[PDB]
Amino acid sequence: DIVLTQTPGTLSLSPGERATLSCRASQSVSSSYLAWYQQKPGQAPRLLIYGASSRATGIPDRFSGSGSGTDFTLTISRLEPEDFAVYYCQQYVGLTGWTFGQGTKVEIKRTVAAPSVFIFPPSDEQLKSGTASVVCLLNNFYPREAKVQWKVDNALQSGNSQESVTEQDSKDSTYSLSSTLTLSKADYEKHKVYACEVTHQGLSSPVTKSFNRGEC
Amino acid sequence: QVQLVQSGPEVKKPGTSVRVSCKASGFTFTSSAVQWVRQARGQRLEWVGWIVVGSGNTNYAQKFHERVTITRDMSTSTAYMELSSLRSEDTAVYYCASPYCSGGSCSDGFDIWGQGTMVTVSSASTKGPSVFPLAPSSKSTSGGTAALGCLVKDYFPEPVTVSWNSGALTSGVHTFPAVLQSSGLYSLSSVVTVPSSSLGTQTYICNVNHKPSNTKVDKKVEPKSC
Numbered sequence: 001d002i003v004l005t006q007t008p009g010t011l012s013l014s015p016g017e018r019a020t021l022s023c024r025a026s027q028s029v030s031s032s033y034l035a036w037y038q039q040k041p042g043q044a045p046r047l048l049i050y051g052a053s054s055r056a057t058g059i060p061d062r063f064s065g066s067g068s069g070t071d072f073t074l075t076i077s078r079l080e081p082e083d084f085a086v087y088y089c090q091q092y093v094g095l096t097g098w099t100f101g102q103g104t105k106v107e108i109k110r111t112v113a114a115p116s117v118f119i120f121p122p123s124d125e126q127l128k129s130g131t132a133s134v135v136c137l138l139n140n141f142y143p144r145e146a147k148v149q150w151k152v153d154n155a156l157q158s159g160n161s162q163e164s165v166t167e168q169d170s171k172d173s174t175y176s177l178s179s180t181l182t183l184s185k186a187d188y189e190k191h192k193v194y195a196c197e198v199t200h201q202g203l204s205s206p207v208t209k210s211f212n213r214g215e216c
Numbered sequence: 217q218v219q220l221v222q223s224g225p226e227v228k229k230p231g232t233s234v235r236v237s238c239k240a241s242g243f244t245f246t247s248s249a250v251q252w253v254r255q256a257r258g259q260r261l262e263w264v265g266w267i268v269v270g271s272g273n274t275n276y277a278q279k280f281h282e283r284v285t286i287t288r289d290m291s292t293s294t295a296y297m298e299l300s301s302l303r304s305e306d307t308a309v310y311y312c313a314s315p316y317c318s319g320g321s322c323s324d325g326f327d328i329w330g331q332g333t334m335v336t337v338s339s340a341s342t343k344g345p346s347v348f349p350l351a352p353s354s355k356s357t358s359g360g361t362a363a364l365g366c367l368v369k370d371y372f373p374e375p376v377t378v379s380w381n382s383g384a385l386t387s388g389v390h391t392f393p394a395v396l397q398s399s400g401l402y403s404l405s406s407v408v409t410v411p412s413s414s415l416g417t418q419t420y421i422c423n424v425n426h427k428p429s430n431t432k433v434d435k436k437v438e439p440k441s442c
Contacts, residue, residue, distance in 0.1 A: 001278065035325055037261075044311050044329035045253075045261065056327050057316070088261055095275040100253075100261040116409070118356035118363035123348040126367070135350055137363050137407050139390075164392035164404065176390040178405050180367075182397075211355050216442035 002027045002091050006101035012109040012143070019076040021104045023067075023089030031068040035090045038083075039103075041167045045088065049074065076106070084108050084168070107144075110173040114202025115141035119209035121216070122188060132188030134181040136196030136209065140174040147199035148179040151210075152191045157181060188213065218242040220250075220312050220330035227336045227373045227428070233300040236333045238312030240293040243328065245269055247317035250295035251326055252286060254308035254335075257393075262308070267295060302337045309334055336373045340400035344429030345371035347422065350405065353440035357412050364437045365407035366422035370399065371429065378406040379423040415439040 003026035013019055023034070031052035037045040047056040049065035052072060062077045076083055089101040115138035122132040136148055144165070150157035160183065166176045179196065195210035223237040238250055251266035265276035267286040274286050285298040295312060310333045313326035350356070350365035357363075368376050378391050388409045394402040406422055416439075424433040 039261075044332055045313075046329070047323075047325045047327040050325035054324065056325060057323060090261070090263075096265070096277060098251075098263040098277070100263065102260040116358040116361060116363075118358065118407075120350040120356055120363075120365070123351070123367070126346070126348040126369070129346060131369070133348070133367055133369065133403075135365070135367065135405055137356070137365075137390075137405075139358075139361075139363065139409055162395045162397075162403075164395055166390050166392065176392075176407075178390075178392045178407070180395075180403070180405065209355060216353050216355065216440050 001097050002029060002093065002099055004089050004091060004099055004101035006087075006089060006104045008104060009102075010105045010107055012107045013079055014109050015079050015081055017079050019079055019083070019106055021074040021087050021106075023072040023074070023101050025070045025072070025091060028069045029072075029091045029093060033091055033093045034065075034067070034072050035092065036065055036074045037088045037090065038085045039088065040085045048087075079106070081108075108168060108173040110142050112202045113140060113142045113174055115139055115146065115177070115198060115200055117196065117198050117207050117209045119194070119196050119211060121194065121211050121213070127185055127188070130185050132183045132185055134183075134194050134196075136179040136181075136198075138175075138177040138179075138198060138200075140169070140172060140176060141200060141202060142174050143201060144175050145201070146177060148177065149197040149199075150179070150181045151193070151195040151197060152181075153193050218316060218328055220314060220328055222310075222312060222330040222333045225334040225336075227338070228302050230303060230337060230339055232302050233298060234302060234335055235296055235298045236310050236312075236335070238295040238297075238330050240295075240314060240328075243314070244317040244319055245293040245314070246290055247320050247322055248314045250286070250288065251313050252297045252310060253313065254310045256308045264297060264299075264310070269295070304337050306335065306337045334374065338372070338400055340372040342428045343370065343372050343401060344426050344431035345369060345376055345424060345433070347424045347433040347435045349435055349437045350407065351437055351440050352410075352412075352415055353442055360412050361409050362412040362415055362439075363407055363409050364420055364439075365405050366424065366435050366437065367403070367405050368424055369403045370397070370401040371403075371426055371431075372401050373428060374402055376402075376404070377425040378404075380406075380408055381419070381421055382423055385420070
């Protein structure tokens with residue numbers, strides 16, 4: 001089957017800037033069978049371009065498509081706030097075998113914003129039920145890249161934490177992130193000092209939030 | 217208006233079949249076509265197949281040709297995707313799409329999209345969440361801002377709904393995407409940042425609803441003085 005590979009993976013651009021998105025096909029695709037779609041979080045795809053360069057009905061002038069064979073380009077001449085989204089190319093050669101690229105996320109670039117960091121020991125209620133979740137919260141930071149490391153009695157933890165991240169905020173263009181350390185009640189009660197260490201571009205040195213088990 | 221409306225979310229055990237419907241209104245469905253495309257969270261769009269409404273002629277992707285059927289009922293302007301022998305890898309949002317048509321004339325591409333149908337395939341059994349407070353303290357107070365929340369742990373299936381103060385508190389709320397645990401159950405935290413000076417005069421209650429397990433929890437999050 002035809003494989004479509006999009007580049008780059010993420011474009012971080014200021015509103016008003018030009019966006020150039022690349023779609024490479026593993027096999028020569030006729031210009032007549034290449035489409036581009038826009039997709040926002042929690043929404044269905046939206047058709048932008050059909051036949052490589054034709055705008056779908058009502059699509060703004062700032063969206064244009066170029067190319068043929070193995071190399072296609074989507075241009076957004078001047079990014080509006082509503083244009084920050086994931087963009088997919090699709091080949092629809094023949095009656096079957098249609099495939100999509102992996103997508104390019106066009107993300108809002110804003111100034112560096114250090115996260116505020118908050119730590120939550122396990123609740124008395126949860127410990128009663130036999131589990132211990134320690135939650136570390138990073139609030140309203142940019143860029144997305146953040147290292148969140150768990151230290152239990154100064155020992156770096158591996159394979160016992162999960163991260164979850166919000167979609168980029170529509171109004172302040174920041175992210176928020178949870179890191180949750182999950183232990184058995186038994187394992188939690190063996191150690192004293194629980195620390196969340198945050199590394200981020202907005203922090204000149206890592207920020208540690210920590211507590212001693214049972215103090216609060 | 218011009219729309220495709222899909223059936224509600226589906227939760228299925230391995231080996232079963234799911235049927236998703238796609239109802240057209242506001243355009244000439246008889247002139248049109250319906251394709252089905254799926255998307256697993258944080259993964260690329262995957263094409264399933266399509267049907268031409270007039271003829272009922274179908275074309276399926278290689279991956280699905282032995283276990284998918286696409287049909288349409290022209291009288292009800294509805295198309296269906298039936299996917300059989302479901303496996304965990306079939307967990308995704310399934311979308312239908314059509315070219316807009318007005319009489320005989322149609323758009324070249326698929327420009328009308330359904331809202332999507334969440335399909336979960338898992339061996340996991342329905343379980344209500346445990347709701348634990350994330351209490352504000354000196355360890356969750358940065359400058360003049362306090363963070364507080366609720367840990368919504370070990371439930372199946374998606375989704376849970378989380379509100380704060382019966383929907384009165386929305387500014388500063390972060391309800392994190394659920395993480396699928398090794399157990400096959402989901403967990404998430406819902407947090408809110410607030411002015412630290414509010415903790416003494418404003419009550420904070422997280423309202424957690426999980427319809428499949430008949431779970432309704434209203435957890436008051438009590439500030440710690442340490």
